Amino acid sequence: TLEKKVRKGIESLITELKLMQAVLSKVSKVPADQLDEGVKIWAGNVKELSYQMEDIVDAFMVRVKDLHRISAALEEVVLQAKQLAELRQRYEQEMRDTSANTSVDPRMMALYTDVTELVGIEETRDKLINMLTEGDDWSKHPLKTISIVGFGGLGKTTLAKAAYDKIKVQFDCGAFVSVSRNPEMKKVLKDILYGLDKVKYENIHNAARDEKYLIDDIIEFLNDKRYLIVIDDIWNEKAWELIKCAFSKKSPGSRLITTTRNVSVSEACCSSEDDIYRMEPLSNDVSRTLFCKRIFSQEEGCPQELLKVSEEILKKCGGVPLAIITIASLLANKGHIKAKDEWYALLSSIGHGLTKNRSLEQMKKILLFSYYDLPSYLKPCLLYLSIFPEDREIRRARLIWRWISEGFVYSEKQDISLYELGDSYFNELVNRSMIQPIGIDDEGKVKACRVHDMVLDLICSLSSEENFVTILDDPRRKMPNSESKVRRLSIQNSKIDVDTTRMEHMRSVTVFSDNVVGKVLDISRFKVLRVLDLEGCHVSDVGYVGNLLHLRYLGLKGTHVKDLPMEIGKLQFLLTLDLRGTKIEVLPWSVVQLRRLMCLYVDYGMKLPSGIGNLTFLEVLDDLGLSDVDLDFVKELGRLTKLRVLRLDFHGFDQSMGKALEESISNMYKLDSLDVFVNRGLINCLSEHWVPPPRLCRLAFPSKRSWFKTLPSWINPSSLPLLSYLDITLFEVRSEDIQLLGTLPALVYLEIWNYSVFEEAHEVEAPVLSSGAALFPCATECRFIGIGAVPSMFPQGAAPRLKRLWFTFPAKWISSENIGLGMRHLPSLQRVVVDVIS
Amino acid sequence: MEDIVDAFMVRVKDLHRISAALEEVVLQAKQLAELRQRYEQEMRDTSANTSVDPRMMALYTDVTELVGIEETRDKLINMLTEGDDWSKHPLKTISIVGFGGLGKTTLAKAAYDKIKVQFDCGAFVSVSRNPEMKKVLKDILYGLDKVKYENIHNAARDEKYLIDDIIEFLNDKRYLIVIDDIWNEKAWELIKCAFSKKSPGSRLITTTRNVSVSEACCSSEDDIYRMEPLSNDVSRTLFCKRIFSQEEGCPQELLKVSEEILKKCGGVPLAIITIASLLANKGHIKAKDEWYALLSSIGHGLTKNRSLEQM
């Protein structure tokens, strides 16, 4: 009865949501300069109302006393929505004569800069010249493209023009043409035509034929000539392919150049990674020379007392020849306004408030271009990076789980994992040249990520004018004038003002390497809380979570947690549960009560209670402790047919129980990686008659004291052709095992251990790659332990891609003729050191 | 509301139920009324460029790529050029009906490119769904001479005088114009009047997705040119040309998968092109699993993918 009215209101409210995110998505597209401030104010207010409505709908969804509270809340929210409706319309005008001219390109006059000003541009212009002009000799080679990817303002058009200006007189045609974010193909092609001949195509911008006949004209004009066109700032490759068809004829002796901030559109060009040209930030010495060229007259050591400041600030820019230019022009009005005071003020300002200045905003547009080109459902992802401290590394897994728990990832295809979608979001952020990736974790993917400094404080401000995040920093020491409308908090080094009086609807909270937690801060007062992050703290009192219902993320890495409450079953809604580095060594029985989980980063020291097979939705499980286990519990593991990544170590079940689990693995079909740990024994788990899951990529083996008898039969190029990682160890070795392994398609990573060589009195033999010719199309990393891998397995046309190789070499083969090296192989196979054995 | 009105119509106790239903429906109508206005804007500077035609660059494809196009181009040639000898026969049209992307402009261009040097004029002109006759006729004029009619798209005389100009320019010559993608024949009848004079030795070609506008041309079923899906063997050759390097017997275990997929496309040289391009990112991304997934997705969810919506 009453609940029917509530739900019928709720559905209408949700429709109102779709409408309001529609409007907000519409408004946020345009830059915040052409928008009149009335729209700004109205948009801010509707966003604030959007938070409240999302809050109400989430509360109703998690709950179903409460009905009356929900009723009052929804009613009043409708009231102020209705009120805000006409406050807008009450004050508008049209102002037909408001046609203000469109703003010019901020990075246009930057093209008009002095040649004798840039430093260090050399030894890169020459490299890019001879990486494409080496084929200019015998100017009959087929045409090719060389894109240039980068980020921010590291300098792409500058080098493109430099190469364009030098090797130019040896061509019949050419054109330097720019493209904006949302171009008109007719404008672009008119631009190209006017760039070729200005006589016959003088007023080519006037005539408006169509997208076709002008393309036909340009195609006709490009016969029996070498053009060397360059096009820069191409976004959303769908545009480029239209230009691509304009170059569809065979033309020996011509090449073209492209630039963009997305590699993900660059692989669509040149069909080869040998033609992609990454550009790097400048070195420290060149950066210092450039910095001192501007401010100082001729000599830099004259102050001898602001040095520490100088190479402390210059580190923040890193290498981008835009930040250094900006700071050098800003900091010297006329020869050192002053010394060591405003420099330190500037250093403190960056991170929280440096951007708001004069003659500085002319370049922040060049950085917000990339943020504006993002589609929706990705602006929140980029803005989420402001929580973490300035100079720290962010593991991508933490980012993905935080995003999913927040609610920024969702779809309605039902063919997606809800986790590979987060991986897709992360990779889209990466290939847009907005995040630097580092390392490779135990998942076969990127380990962690880092953010550029000026991008960091820029997005910090850009999220700061809204209530998207909130930072408590000593250099900043600022609080918004309204404690009520705070949603996200990123506590940092500051440990003084930890007030929590007026933050009821606190979406999230995190603490970074602080002892202030708990003694000054209370979390239990937060009636709602979406995600909780407390890794690195030194508190073990987390037993108040039973009062929390909306929690999704629960990170407790390195927390000194002795125990966690038995009342955790109330958290029916949950996403992740990380407990690595906790003192608790047994989990409570109230985990069977939980229903929705996909990851469990647990350590094998802890005890897993029986009845684990119920967690069907679980997708990745790490470091499972398999000791003193009954058969039914082991067989439960085959029930949940959704797991993606599993890590196993054990010491106490080496029996036929291994075979019982061994086929129970094959019940799975969603694996990505697997690994097994066991000490000093023959592997009495895997049989030679067991079908593996079709999708397998990593299959590592951490232990080196255990061994297999021989190469398993079920490893074959037939099944599991998706491997990119091998990591095997076994007792014996065969010259035919390598021949078998050379048939698998990818096998990017190779690592093999010969137990008998390093544990028994055996001589390193020389296995022979008998059959085939290459057997290794792409195996960059290959490791052989106790096994002789001479360079002469085959001529250089066997492993095109192999950066590194490791093997053992007897000293008795020095006088032999089986070590016949001396030639250079196809990959960078010149940096090798071998463990020689006497 | 259709439900409510049908219920009332079939029926005439019930009166009160009908009353409540209509009243509440009026209530949701009223509520939804102002939800539209409450969140809406104008954004005068929203002038995004018009979307381009997806099938334009398809016209710009390599000649040495299409297979099996022969023995149909020659057939259409000699079913129109058989009267080209004794080039005094009265002018005639040969329309080309089809559906989907079985390939009509491709064959039209192939015939256009081969038997062309034996004519004084000619023009390949497209028409959209909602054309402007002035635009079409300017297109025709520019395709005849680009010197005297270089900036012919600029001047805006009227639908009359440019028609008179094109009629005048077509004296004592054989033109062989081809016009493709004509829909809603009412557009076509306005153009045929531009070809109203006796011209021995000239013809023209038309294409469309409607036969029902094609009988309006050529006044005879002998001049209608049906075009049909390709044969199984030619389709197999085309399918293996793209994905495979040069030969097909290397897998010897996905063969039956190849035949059971290629049957779904049937014969249309667009579905096979699309699947071949989508299916091999770089040399057989996989083996034997997501082809089964793809086959299963036919019927319910295959269309939602990447680089597929372009067709």
Ligand SMILES: Nc1ncnc2c1ncn2[C@@H]1O[C@H](COP(=O)(O)OP(=O)(O)OP(=O)(O)O)[C@@H](O)[C@H]1O
């Ligand atoms: N060696 C250098 N010395 C001095 N200034 C440099 C140097 N290299 C680049 N710059 C500066 O960097 C900017 C050039 O930017 P860039 O070439 O990357 O432009 P783009 O390709 O249009 O796009 P974006 O800047 O967004 O990457 C200019 O401000 C230029 O003065």
Ligand SMILES: Nc1ncnc2c1ncn2[C@@H]1O[C@H](COP(=O)(O)OP(=O)(O)OP(=O)(O)O)[C@@H](O)[C@H]1O
């Ligand atoms: N023998 C062939 N080999 C390869 N591709 C072909 C072949 N025949 C046709 N195609 C493809 O079919 C498409 C041609 O479409 P078509 O000629 O039917 O266009 P249309 O007349 O403008 O209209 P529609 O496609 O709507 O019927 C192009 O994608 C072309 O590559």
